[PDB]
Paper text:
To determine whether conformational changes accompany the complex formation, we obtained the crystal structure of the apo-state of [name]αCSD and characterized 15N-labeled full-length [name]α by NMR. In agreement, the crystal structure of [name]αCSD in the apo-state showed that the [name]αCSD dimer is in contact with another [name]αCSD dimer (two dimers form an asymmetric unit). The β-sheet binding interface was comprised of primarily hydrophobic residues, such as I126, I127, A129, L136, L139, W142, A148, L150 and V151. In contrast to WT FL [name]α, NMR resonances of CSD in the 1H,15N HSQC spectrum of FL L139E/L150E [name]α became detectable, indicating that mutation of the β-sheet interface residues L139 and L150 disrupted the formation of higher order [name]α oligomers. Overlay of the structures of [name]αCSD in the apo-state (yellow) and [name]αCSD (pink) bound to KAP1Hbox’ within the larger crystal lattice showed that while the protomers [name]αCSD1 and [name]αCSD2 of a dimer can be superimposed, the protomers from the neighboring dimers were oriented distinctly differently in the crystal structure. The orientation of one of the neighboring dimers in the apo-state structure was opposite to its orientation in the complex and overall, the neighboring dimers in the apo state structure were not superimposable (Fig. 6a–c, only one protomer from the neighboring dimers is shown in (a) and (b) for clarity).
In addition to supporting the establishment of H3K9me3 as a recruitment module for [name], [name] contains a [name] box (KAP1Hbox) sequence, which is recognized by the CSD of [name]α ([name]αCSD) in biochemical studies.
Residue numbers in the entry:
A (entry chain A), B (entry chain B): 114 to 173
The structure:
């Protein structure tokens, strides 16, 4: 049971990689310290403001 | 001239600049070649998937 399947609230994306062919985000979930990979596509649609916060922080 | 006030659908963000202290996007609107500066904060809320497509392309 991983990523969104864990049923937790998204908190913060801490990294991204397309190294596997598909863009994936490393998601920090609310009230756990076990982070997981989720598809960018699914995060884009389910928590778009959290995705944007990640990209805006990455701009500087 | 007016940006979102023009009542056009966002097509794509051409680029982004913080050169004014606030993050701004240069927005291409559908069916117009007149691009406009809009606040990132406003695009984030009104057309988040257009913002994300811009950032995803820039990540490559």
């Amino acid at each position: 049971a991983r990523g969104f399947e864990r049923g937790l609230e998204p908190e913060k994306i801490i990294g991204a990689t397309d190294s596997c062919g598909d863009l994936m985000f490393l998601m920090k979930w609310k009230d756990t310290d076990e982070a997981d990979l989720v598809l960018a596509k699914e995060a884009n649609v389910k928590c778009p403001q959290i995705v944007i916060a990640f990209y805006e922080e990455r701009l500087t």
